[PDB]
């Protein structure tokens, strides 16, 4: 039998790493998460105050990477592989620069977009510049997996190296790739999590458009998100990148670490409803819950915390707190959606919810939900929206449920 | 200790479905392949033919995904999307239109790129037909999820769709991938494989340059590849897409299906070594069919056929052969070369070449390498390189080892 105690043995969490629009490292970035204040600002780029549309917003990184290597490493690579690279170099220090065997190392990170404004940079340099003049390996950049790949090199990862994708859930799939690979014998340490591209046009022409990014509201940048409010009206697009190193329990000892939590269970599901759209009823987001709790050994009584991935749309945080009630049924834990205080990552939003899942078992703490009055009438959910509520937190959930139905729930147990 | 006996249960193929060069479907591609026939054509296009390609060779389809879908659908999906659509349809019929719980289905369609191509298309939109005058999910068509999330929806899968990116081992690691969860216990039935887009000169142009496309012999069409010859210049390019139908063997007995082979292990590795060329002794490659051996509880002893990766480099194929040795040893299997006669699909020829394991083994008949007059004398393994050799065939071993070092090995019985 396949569950985390018996057949599974425990992995744990033992450093971490991101770059958010609240701060360039996770330590700072948690602590202006409790003081209550946004990353949210007033979108300003060149694309803006010139090109037209009507959403004028949103969290962007607090750090440039151009400055933080050598004038080799730049040509060599591309935007989201300078990321990866930098935010590895950073885990590997927060661990404790451990000297693991690379024979049992691997990498797994996603994203949800992928090198897209580096296409008009090489595809229109061949019609001008040369096919004899530019770069050997400038393949591998545009890759959509190149931020893996990259970090796969680094530390001689020779256990693996994966890129899932999955628009919104792709930083958590990483994650739960990582986990399954550990659990199955395919490993004993990870490196996992996400990394998405920066700001671009593209996306959010044909975005704005639709009802999603219904967050016109580009008068209150930091007040614009507002996921369970009743007056919600939609979602905010943020930066950043998140990583993290998980690795055996036994592991870990043998070395000692500083671990922070454990990773107990993580499922992966489909809606194979809508392309664009979640299910009403979050029949199967509900579910990928319920085997997250039992791939742990647990019960829906012994969650605490559910970080949920709510953006602020409309059909979006109504059938997800549909689904939370499905898998819990009258068992009501505290629920906090970061998203409102930091913004959509995207490709990357689910690893850095799932650094926030650590640190509130870590600390035993919850930061609140930014903008919140009246909680949604046909919303049934505990959000914290006040003040951060300290407590006794044994189990926790993290939710990533991105665009076109994909679903995936990871179990955060306390250490 | 898990194994397909006892931790796992037993998986098989149900169905097939793939578009090559050769042919525009599985069946008619093995004929012409046993047949000792190549699909590789002068290469013929505007910016190879007329700009500037050293290599005028290349292995093009034999159709058009257009004549076959709706003014609608050919308006919400781009070229990969509409592939992986047709493929599916094709599958579920040779799969004898089966009616499954698609709460237990489940799809992973991995890529080398995605749909690069689409970005132009829709970026230089708006600089143009306006922010308002395209279409809103246009951004889905250019994720690198597009033909998973497009197949997921078709049929109402609901197990998880998921999309692997490894390059060259993408189409490999979807079927692997598959077979995990269905034997995690996470679905009872997937559609999995690969695809990839046409030849480009965005790719060919930074890669003719390096040493490995040094399969410049355009004066010679068929007669260039040769994947363990001594005289092997490099490797050529082609087209195709693959997909099959794994569920366990319990259900696949109770709706009485078609059962061609036995799909019983995969392992998922990389090298950490380099961005192009891999490790020249092949030690993590050669692990990857170790653990492909043992996760089907076999031995080394045990496989016949070997449907090697091999694409017909210099330092690619010695460091195959020098793997294939260190996982089994003394044993010596019939090794196949498919490349040879179709050529490199990338994100699709893992699953390709999966699909030719399984005739193998249905058929108990391996077709020759296109190319072997005199094999490297630096490589000992048991090629076919004349006539079709039959006989019996109990287990075998697909190998892709994309560049940069993306290893999979997948365990294929027969029934």
Redesign the interface.
């Known amino acids: 039998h ?1 569950v985390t105690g018996k ?1 599974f043995p425990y992995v744990v969490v033992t450093g971490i790493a991101m770059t958010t629009a609240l701060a360039t490292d996770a330590e700072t970035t948690w602590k202006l998460l409790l003081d209550r204040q946004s990353g949210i600002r007033t979108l300003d780029d060149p694309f803006v105050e010139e ?3 009507p959403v004028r917003i949103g969290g962007h990184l607090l750090e440039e990477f151009d400055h933080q290597l050598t004038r080799i490493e730049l040509r060599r690579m591309g935007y989201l592989q300078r990321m990866s690279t930098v935010l590895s170099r950073r885990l590997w220090e927060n661990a404790g620069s451990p000297e693991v065997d ?2 049992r190392l ?2 797994s990170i996603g ?4 090198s ?1 404004e580096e ?2 940079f ?2 229109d340099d ?1 019609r001008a510049r040369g ?2 003049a ?7 950049k ?4 190149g931020a893996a ?1 990259a970090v ?2 680094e ?13 919104c859930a792709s930083g958590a ?1 990483a994650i739960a790739r990582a986990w ?2 550990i659990v ?3 490993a004993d340490a990870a490196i996992c999590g996400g990394v998405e591209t920066r700001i671009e ?3 959010i ?3 704005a ?2 009802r999603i990014v219904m967050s016109t509201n580009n008068d209150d940048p930091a007040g614009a998100c507002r996921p369970f409010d009743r007056d919600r009206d939609g979602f905010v697009f943020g930066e950043g990148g998140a990583l993290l190193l998980i690795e055996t329990e036994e592991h870990a000892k043998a070395r000692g670490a500083n671990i922070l939590a454990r990773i107990m269970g993580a ?7 809508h ?2 759209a979640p299910d009403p009823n979050g029949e ?1 987001a509900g579910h990928a819950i319920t ?1 997250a709790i039992q791939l742990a050994g647990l019960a829906p009584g012994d969650i605490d915390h559910v970080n949920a991935h709510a953006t602020g749309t409309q059909v979006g945080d109504l059938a997800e707190g549909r689904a939370i009630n499905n898998a819990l049924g009258g068992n009501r834990p505290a629920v906090y959606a970061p998203k409102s205080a930091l913004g959509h990552s995207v490709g990357a939003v689910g690893a850095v919810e799932s650094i926030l899942t650590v640190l509130a078992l870590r600390d035993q703490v919850i930061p609140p939900t930014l903008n919140l009055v009246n909680l949604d009438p046909e919303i049934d959910l505990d959000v914290v929206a006040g003040e951060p509520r300290p407590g006794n937190y044994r189990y926790a959930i993290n939710n990533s449920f991105g665009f ?3 679903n995936v729930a990871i179990a955060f147990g306390r250490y």
Do not use: C, W
């Not at 994203?111 to 992928?114: A, P, Q």
């Not at 545009?142 to 997996?145: L, S």
């Open positions: 396949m057949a090109f037209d549309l690379t024979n691997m990498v994203t949800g977009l992928g897209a296409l008009v090489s595809y061949m096919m004899k530019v770069s050997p390996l400038t393949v591998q545009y890759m959509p997996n790949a796969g090199l530390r001689h990862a020779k256990a693996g190296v994966m890129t899932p994708v999955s628009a799939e399954q690979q199955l014998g395919e046009a593209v996306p022409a044909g975005f458009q639709m499922s992966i599901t489909s809606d194979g409803f392309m664009v199967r085997r076109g139905g994909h």
